[PDB]
Design a binder for this molecule. Structure first.
Ligand SMILES: *[C@@H]1O[C@H](CO)[C@@H](O)[C@H](O)[C@H]1NC(C)=O
Lengths: 107, 49
């Protein structure tokens, strides 16, 4: 359901949080003191709001912009990545200005 | 004194990189252990206009 990106991930430097709420996508950049092992279930320089599936994402950070590309496709078989080709299309281009060296996934 | 600038950093910024951090700059052989001292500095000056 989302990702953490940054350098320290402790509050000593800013970090980027991306979360999917099913109603919305929520994106926030802050001096977060993130959990030692983050989880989901039922200050701050920037904020923004807007097996059978394979969901693909590309992330890169260039000149302070954080760029995201994505694609969704069905799959016929469940063992690992399906051999073939389709191109990811640009999702968003966030003007955040933060440095990134590590990331983590929100299960 | 409301206006400040960073005098020291570990490395130069990338284009449009923004860095808030006030962790103590080590300028030499002194192990700073999170506090100021000889060759250990709070990295922001003020203009004092
Ligand atoms: C970005 O963060 C890393 C964290 O290890 C640091 O080494 C590097 O100096 C930073 N980049 C810049 C351009 O200062």
């Amino acid at each position: 359901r989302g990702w953490i990106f940054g350098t320290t991930l402790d509050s000593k430097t800013q970090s980027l949080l991306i979360v999917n709420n099913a109603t919305n996508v929520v994106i926030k950049v802050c001096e977060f003191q993130f959990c030692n092992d983050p989880f989901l279930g039922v200050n701050c320089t920037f904020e923004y709001v807007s097996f059978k599936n394979l969901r693909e994402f590309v992330f890169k950070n260039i000149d302070g912009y954080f760029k995201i590309y994505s694609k969704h496709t069905p799959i016929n078989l469940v063992r690992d990545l399906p051999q073939g080709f389709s191109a990811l299309e640009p999702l968003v281009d966030l003007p955040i200005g933060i440095n990134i060296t590590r990331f983590q996934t929100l299960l | 004194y409301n206006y400040l600038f960073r005098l020291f950093r570990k490395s130069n910024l990338k284009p449009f990189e923004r860095d808030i951090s006030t962790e103590i700059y080590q300028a030499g052989s002194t192990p700073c252990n999170g506090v100021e001292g000889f060759n250990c500095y709070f990295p922001l000056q003020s203009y004092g206009f």
